[PDB]
């Protein structure tokens, strides 16, 4: 697994500190420099990822592709790689194997077309979970660039993908081997002679079946990469719950809530028990900005690493060692996370 | 007065919900019959389950001073609470810095030590001479409580009071002093621990007036019940008219903010306030019956779609549908909230300078106008294997060269 | 954010300590500089931290320069996408603000022809010798087999310098005549 | 640095507890008290 | 630590050290051949 972004998250300066009480915000206005410059920053990062996000897609797009049968493309079965098809490919765009890979991942959904009204409506008691809670601590998760669909799109192109031959030197011809033969070549280079029984075509398909068959079975704790997978949902998650844990803090004063402040005390001394709340929440802000900074640029140096693998082992076998997987390394593949 | 060119997250009069029992007036009758009692043979009156009348109170006594911590006497005054304490009695005006926090003198050792558990109000105040509370003989207060061990009874171990308790001297004279100094010795039993108790009270002459002293503590989340100042019903008794509505709330000593819809009952029907595991009000069982959950007050995000070179201009309602829109150009529904001053032309691009996010794009289609368009992913050269002896293979027949920046 | 850093109140009356000093008695005055001394401190411990997230962060992006200019600059690279986009002849280096700049010149050609390329030429006899093309293709004249480069189209004769001998295969096309010179006899 | 933000004021009288103990009255006890326990839990989230 | 004066002599002196390369196996020889040259080498490799 290789993370290339993170959530893209935004805040409202003047919802998070002062809770919509006109009370406080008459104080706010005598900051409003310190919401600037944490409204300005995020938008930067947020920003950032955008240009990020653009250059990974472009440095792992396919010049050219040719075309593969649903399964059994020459004795190799592939379908779990493959959208699924009655007749011709319907219902969706994500492969097989992304339909497991994602059913196993707890994840909330942002609901980015009609999240506010869904959270209106349901959720008696779950208008505080860290998706629901956003419209009431005035942070915002923002959508990431593309669609699933393009992403899915993306991937797809790569199964198909076409280079040059297999013995010849350059990155500016495409041959339009097919699959089964392409294997073959790339068995033959590690080692492998050619007069090994007709390469035993039956019985390295059958075990290349079998090995990417049984790669299901993968998708638990247990599993290294899976269990980073699930890591990087709740680093996210982890993220939210901090920001919104930080408005129950009370800071020094009599309590968290300005309702609370406003109701149990006098005017004179009220204003300093807000005092209170206002210079928190905003030294808070300055530490969320700080680090969802630094997790924007860890993400934007490992998309680099991302789009490595797919060019130096994806587009091409590679002769090094350890560096795409265990063992003498044949093919790889690779979806969305 | 200059923005760049990008998409921009920028930034109705509350009402009020009270909820209050019809309950009957607090009687502080008890106060105002027999002789007022010393300070450390205070009295203490609990109220809970009724209401108040301040006109009285301030009538009835002259304020001198009114220390308060936690809280402040006009929040007691204009709120209503779960459970109101009053520990009242005799103490001379002459000496109100003894009672003090801090004090070094006796009165916090053995005569009355007020506790900071709760929000509390010391007030030191003068009963007028029409005010019938029949005035004391001279002051007292105890200036040793110890208890005396040892085989020649040399050994002497001060007794110290708690906050809010009272003295174990109490019972030598409960009603006062004959004489300044007076000494009191009693014999404690077995189960007492044992030994020679040792009192002793000071009497401070009577003033011309009585003065008294008041402790108020207020408890909160004590009950199911309110102490309430006397207030006409007024017209925000009910919320069945106002759901979806969010309002300032004042339910039987719980105050706050929130918007209040109808579901099925959860929890204890007796406690009638229903908490999250973060103790805020999620659940109400009002007085009509039904059960109501409370939420959060909510806000609807906004962002700004600008483009510079064009100085054009559209909002985004982020993940908002657009029938909410129009009940609180033409609204557009898209993949990622409503938006409001981009037009659907079903136009399709391959790549903007305006990302929305999605796979969408606002591009400002030139003769003036916003257009929403959708990215298009651009499928590369699908080879075709025409069917021979070999494999079909792509060469160049012409090359540029390109230089890439890094 | 430094500069802006120090006109924080931090609950204070003021930001500055003139207007502190100049409101406020000398019991009261030490209890409102302590809020600027203790905050303004705190804001350089956000600094120092971050301050050597930054530096580390470039460090390490120094390392990642260095075998760049190794790989790019210095000779050739056979990697994908490694040294721009395209494959990879030269590259240039100059300095730039706080790092290096680089141009990757690459080869990307332009138009594209369709061949037939077979795998290979085997000889039509016994103990057949099989050759394939060497950084190249084997394409037909539209029989003659003939060589072109795989970057760019020019077909020429076949000889043992762009043939290599490998073992015959089934998908290898037979030979009756029209023998490339290396397989003749 | 994580021991030396153990002896880190915050505004208090005193670092140590064991002096706002012995210093002062029971109001204002719980009054310090509370500003070692705002500090030395910020620092310790800066650790994290 | 370095002026742009002796900052740009580094870079400056690598755009000159193809007698740096030395095509061979190995890194330890150096080989004086000019840029004309070695372009038409490095091109001829790609494929062309
Ligand atoms: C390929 O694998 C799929 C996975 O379920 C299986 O349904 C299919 O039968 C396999 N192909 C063949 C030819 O058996
Ligand atoms: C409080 O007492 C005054 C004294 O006359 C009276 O006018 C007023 O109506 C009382 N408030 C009530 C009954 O709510
Ligand atoms: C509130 O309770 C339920 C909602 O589940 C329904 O009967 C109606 O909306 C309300 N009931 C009454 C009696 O108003
Ligand atoms: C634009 O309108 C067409 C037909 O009215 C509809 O199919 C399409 O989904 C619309 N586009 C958007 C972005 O709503």
Same mark, same amino acid.
């Given at each position: 697994?290789?993370?290339?972004?993170?959530?893209?998250?935004?805040?409202?300066?003047?919802?998070?500190?002062?809770?919509?009480?006109? =009370?406080?915000?008459?104080?706010?206005?005598?900051?409003?420099?310190?919401? &600037?410059?944490?409204?300005?920053?995020?938008?930067?990062?947020?920003?950032?990822?955008?240009?990020?996000?653009?250059?990974?897609?472009?440095?792992?797009?396919?010049?050219?592709?040719?075309?593969?049968?649903?399964?059994?493309?020459?004795?190799?079965?592939?379908?779990?790689?493959?959208?699924?098809?009655?007749?011709?490919?319907?219902?969706?765009?994500?492969?097989?194997?992304?339909?497991?890979?994602?059913?196993?991942?707890?994840?909330?959904?942002?609901?980015?077309?009609?999240?506010?009204?869904?959270?209106?409506?349901?959720?008696?008691?779950?208008?505080?979970?860290?998706?629901?809670?956003?419209?009431?601590?005035?942070?915002?998760?923002?959508?990431?660039?593309?669609?699933?669909?393009?992403?899915?799109?993306?991937?797809?192109?790569?199964?198909?993908?076409?280079?040059?031959?297999?013995?010849?030197?350059?990155?500016?011809?495409?041959?339009?081997?097919?699959?089964?033969?392409?294997?073959?070549?790339?068995?033959?280079?590690?080692?492998?002679?050619?007069?090994?029984?007709?390469?035993? %075509?039956?019985?390295?398909?059958?075990?290349?079946?079998?090995?990417?068959?049984?790669?299901?079975?993968?998708?638990?704790?247990?599993?290294? $990469?899976?269990?980073?997978? %699930?890591?990087?949902?709740?680093?996210?998650?982890?993220?939210?719950?901090?920001?919104?844990?930080?408005?129950?803090?009370?800071?020094?004063?009599?309590?968290?809530?300005?309702?609370?402040?406003?109701?149990?005390?006098?005017?004179?001394?009220?204003?300093?028990?807000?005092?209170?709340?206002?210079?928190?929440?905003?030294?808070?802000?300055?530490?969320?900005?700080?680090?969802?900074?630094?997790?924007?640029?860890?993400?934007?140096?490992?998309?680099?690493?991302?789009?490595?693998?797919?060019?130096?082992?994806?587009?091409?076998?590679?002769?090094?060692?350890?560096?795409?997987?265990?063992?003498?390394?044949?093919?790889?593949?690779?979806?969305?996370? | 007065?200059?923005?760049?060119?990008?998409?921009?997250?920028?930034?109705?009069?509350?009402?009020?919900?009270?909820?209050?029992?019809?309950?009957?007036?607090?009687?502080?009758?008890?106060?105002?019959?027999?002789?007022?009692?010393?300070?450390?043979?205070?009295?203490?009156?609990?109220?809970?389950?009724?209401?108040?009348?301040?006109?009285?109170?301030?009538?009835?006594?002259?304020?001198?001073?009114?220390?308060?911590?936690?809280?402040?006497?006009?929040?007691?005054? =204009?709120?209503?609470?779960?459970?109101?304490?009053?520990?009242?009695?005799?103490?001379?005006?002459?000496?109100?810095?003894?009672?003090?926090?801090?004090?070094?003198?006796?009165?916090?050792?053995?005569?009355?030590?007020?506790?900071?558990?709760?929000?509390?109000?010391?007030?030191?105040?003068?009963? #007028?001479?029409?005010?019938?509370?029949?005035?004391?003989?001279?002051?007292?207060?105890? &200036?040793?409580?110890?208890?005396?061990?040892?085989? @020649?009874?040399?050994?002497?171990?001060?007794?110290?009071?708690?906050?809010?308790? @009272? *003295?174990?001297? =109490?019972?030598?004279?409960?009603?006062? !002093?004959?004489?300044?100094?007076?000494?009191?010795?009693?014999?404690?039993?077995?189960?007492?621990?044992?030994?020679?108790?040792?009192?002793?009270?000071?009497?401070?002459?009577?003033?011309?007036?009585?003065?008294?002293?008041?402790?108020?503590?207020?408890?909160?989340?004590?009950?199911?019940?309110?102490?309430?100042?006397?207030?006409?019903?007024?017209?925000?008794?009910?919320?069945?008219?106002?759901?979806?509505?969010?309002?300032?709330?004042?339910?039987?000593?719980?105050?706050?903010?929130?918007?209040?819809?109808?579901?099925?009952?959860?929890?204890?029907?007796?406690?009638?306030?229903?908490?999250?595991?973060?103790?805020?009000?999620?659940?109400? @069982?009002?007085?009509?019956?039904?059960?109501?959950?409370?939420?959060?007050?909510?806000?609807?995000?906004?962002?700004?779609?600008?483009?510079?070179?064009?100085?054009?201009?559209?909002?985004?309602?982020? *993940?908002?549908?657009?029938?909410?829109?129009?009940?609180?150009?033409?609204?557009?529904?898209?993949?990622?909230?409503?938006?409001?001053?981009?037009?659907?032309?079903?136009?399709?691009?391959?790549?903007?300078?305006?990302?929305?996010?999605?796979?969408?794009?606002?591009? #400002?289609?030139?003769?003036?106008?916003?257009?929403?368009?959708?990215?298009?992913?651009?499928?590369?050269?699908?080879?075709?294997?025409?069917?021979?002896?070999? !494999?079909? $293979?792509?060469?160049?027949?012409?090359?540029?060269?390109?230089?890439?920046?890094? | 954010?430094?500069?802006?850093?120090?006109?924080?109140?931090?609950?204070?009356?003021?930001?500055?300590?003139?207007?502190?000093?100049?409101?406020?008695?000398?019991?009261? %005055?030490?209890?409102?500089?302590?809020?600027?001394?203790?905050?303004?401190?705190?804001?350089?411990?956000?600094?120092?931290?971050?301050?050597?997230?930054?530096?580390?962060?470039?460090?390490?992006?120094?390392?990642?320069?260095?075998?760049?200019?190794?790989?790019?600059?210095?000779? %050739?690279?056979?990697?994908?996408?490694?040294?721009?986009?395209?494959?990879?002849?030269?590259?240039?280096?100059?300095?730039?603000?706080?790092?290096?700049?680089?141009?990757?010149?690459?080869?990307?050609?332009?138009?594209?022809?369709?061949?037939?390329?077979?795998?290979?030429?085997?000889?039509?006899?016994?103990?057949?010798?099989?050759?394939?093309?060497?950084?190249?293709?084997?394409?037909?004249?539209?029989?003659?087999?003939?060589?072109?480069?795989?970057?760019?189209?020019?077909?020429?004769?076949?000889?043992?310098?762009?043939?290599?001998?490998?073992?015959?295969?089934?998908?290898?096309?037979?030979?009756?005549?029209?023998?490339?010179?290396?397989?003749?006899?």
């Amino acid at each position: 697994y290789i993370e290339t972004s993170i959530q893209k998250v935004t805040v409202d300066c003047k919802q998070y500190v002062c809770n919509g009480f006109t =009370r406080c915000e008459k104080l706010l206005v005598e900051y409003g420099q310190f919401c &600037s410059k944490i409204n300005q920053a995020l938008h930067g990062a947020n920003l950032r990822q955008d240009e990020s996000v653009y250059s990974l897609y472009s440095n792992i797009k396919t010049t050219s592709t040719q075309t593969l049968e649903y399964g059994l493309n020459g004795d190799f079965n592939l379908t779990l790689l493959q959208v699924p098809q009655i007749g011709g490919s319907p219902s969706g765009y994500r492969s097989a194997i992304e339909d497991l890979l994602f059913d196993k991942v707890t994840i909330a959904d942002p609901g980015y077309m009609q999240g506010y009204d869904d959270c209106m409506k349901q959720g008696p008691q779950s208008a505080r979970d860290l998706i629901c809670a956003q419209y009431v601590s005035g942070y915002k998760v923002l959508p990431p660039l593309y669609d699933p669909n393009m992403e899915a799109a993306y991937t797809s192109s790569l199964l198909g993908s076409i280079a040059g031959a297999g013995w010849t030197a350059g990155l500016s011809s495409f041959a339009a081997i097919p699959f089964a033969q392409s294997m073959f070549y790339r068995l033959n280079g590690v080692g492998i002679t050619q007069q090994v029984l007709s390469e035993n %075509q039956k019985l390295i398909a059958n075990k290349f079946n079998q090995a990417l068959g049984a790669m299901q079975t993968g998708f638990t704790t247990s599993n290294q $990469a899976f269990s980073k997978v %699930q890591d990087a949902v709740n680093a996210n998650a982890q993220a939210l719950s901090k920001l919104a844990s930080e408005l129950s803090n009370t800071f020094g004063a009599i309590s968290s809530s300005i309702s609370d402040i406003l109701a149990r005390l006098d005017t004179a001394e009220q204003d300093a028990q807000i005092d209170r709340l206002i210079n928190g929440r905003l030294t808070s802000l300055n530490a969320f900005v700080s680090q969802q900074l630094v997790r924007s640029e860890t993400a934007a140096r490992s998309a680099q690493l991302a789009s490595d693998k797919v060019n130096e082992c994806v587009k091409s076998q590679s002769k090094r060692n350890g560096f795409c997987g265990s063992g003498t390394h044949i093919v790889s593949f690779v979806v969305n996370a | 007065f200059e923005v760049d060119t990008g998409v921009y997250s920028v930034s109705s009069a509350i009402g009020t919900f009270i909820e209050q029992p019809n309950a009957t007036e607090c009687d502080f009758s008890p106060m105002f019959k027999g002789v007022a009692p010393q300070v450390y043979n205070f009295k203490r009156l609990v109220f809970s389950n009724c209401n108040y009348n301040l006109t009285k109170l301030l009538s009835l006594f002259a304020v001198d001073e009114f220390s308060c911590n936690g809280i402040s006497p006009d929040a007691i005054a =204009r709120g209503c609470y779960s459970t109101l304490t009053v520990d009242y009695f005799a103490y001379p005006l002459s000496m109100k810095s003894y009672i003090r926090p801090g004090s070094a003198g006796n009165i916090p050792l053995y005569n009355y030590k007020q506790s900071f558990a709760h929000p509390t109000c010391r007030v030191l105040a003068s009963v #007028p001479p029409n005010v019938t509370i029949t005035k004391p003989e001279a002051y007292g207060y105890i &200036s040793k409580c110890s208890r005396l061990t040892g085989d @020649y009874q040399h050994i002497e171990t001060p007794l110290y009071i708690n906050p809010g308790e @009272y *003295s174990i001297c =109490r019972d030598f004279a409960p009603l006062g !002093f004959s004489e300044d100094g007076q000494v009191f010795k009693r014999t404690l039993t077995q189960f007492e621990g044992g030994g020679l108790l040792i009192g002793v009270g000071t009497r401070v002459p009577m003033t011309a007036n009585l003065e008294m002293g008041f402790v108020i503590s207020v408890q909160y989340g004590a009950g199911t019940d309110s102490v309430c100042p006397m207030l006409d019903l007024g017209e925000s008794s009910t919320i069945t008219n106002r759901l979806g509505k969010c309002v300032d709330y004042s339910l039987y000593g719980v105050t706050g903010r929130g918007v209040f819809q109808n579901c099925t009952a959860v929890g204890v029907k007796q406690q009638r306030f229903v908490y999250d595991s973060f103790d805020n009000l999620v659940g109400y @069982y009002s007085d009509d019956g039904n059960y109501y959950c409370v939420r959060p007050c909510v806000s609807v995000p906004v962002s700004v779609i600008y483009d510079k070179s064009t100085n054009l201009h559209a909002t985004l309602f982020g *993940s908002v549908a657009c029938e909410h829109v129009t009940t609180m150009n033409a609204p557009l529904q898209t993949a990622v909230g409503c938006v409001i001053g981009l037009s659907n032309n079903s136009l399709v691009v391959s790549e903007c300078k305006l990302p929305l996010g999605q796979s969408l794009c606002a591009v #400002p289609s030139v003769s003036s106008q916003f257009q929403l368009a959708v990215l298009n992913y651009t499928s590369p050269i699908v080879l075709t294997p025409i069917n021979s002896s070999g !494999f079909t $293979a792509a060469i160049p027949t012409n090359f540029s060269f390109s230089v890439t920046q890094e | 954010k430094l500069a802006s850093e120090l006109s924080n109140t931090f609950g204070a009356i003021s930001s500055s300590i003139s207007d502190i000093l100049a409101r406020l008695d000398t019991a009261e %005055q030490d209890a409102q500089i302590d809020r600027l001394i203790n905050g303004r401190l705190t804001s350089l411990n956000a600094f120092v931290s971050q301050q050597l997230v930054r530096s580390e962060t470039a460090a390490r992006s120094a390392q990642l320069a260095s075998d760049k200019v190794n790989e790019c600059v210095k000779s %050739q690279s056979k990697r994908n996408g490694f040294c721009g986009s395209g494959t990879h002849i030269v590259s240039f280096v100059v300095n730039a603000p706080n790092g290096f700049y680089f141009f990757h010149v690459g080869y990307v050609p332009t138009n594209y022809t369709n061949v037939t390329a077979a795998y290979g030429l085997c000889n039509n006899n016994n103990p057949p010798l099989c050759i394939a093309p060497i950084d190249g293709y084997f394409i037909t004249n539209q029989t003659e087999w003939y060589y072109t480069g795989s970057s760019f189209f020019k077909p020429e004769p076949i000889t043992q310098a762009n043939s290599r001998y490998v073992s015959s295969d089934v998908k290898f096309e037979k030979l009756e005549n029209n023998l490339p010179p290396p397989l003749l006899e």
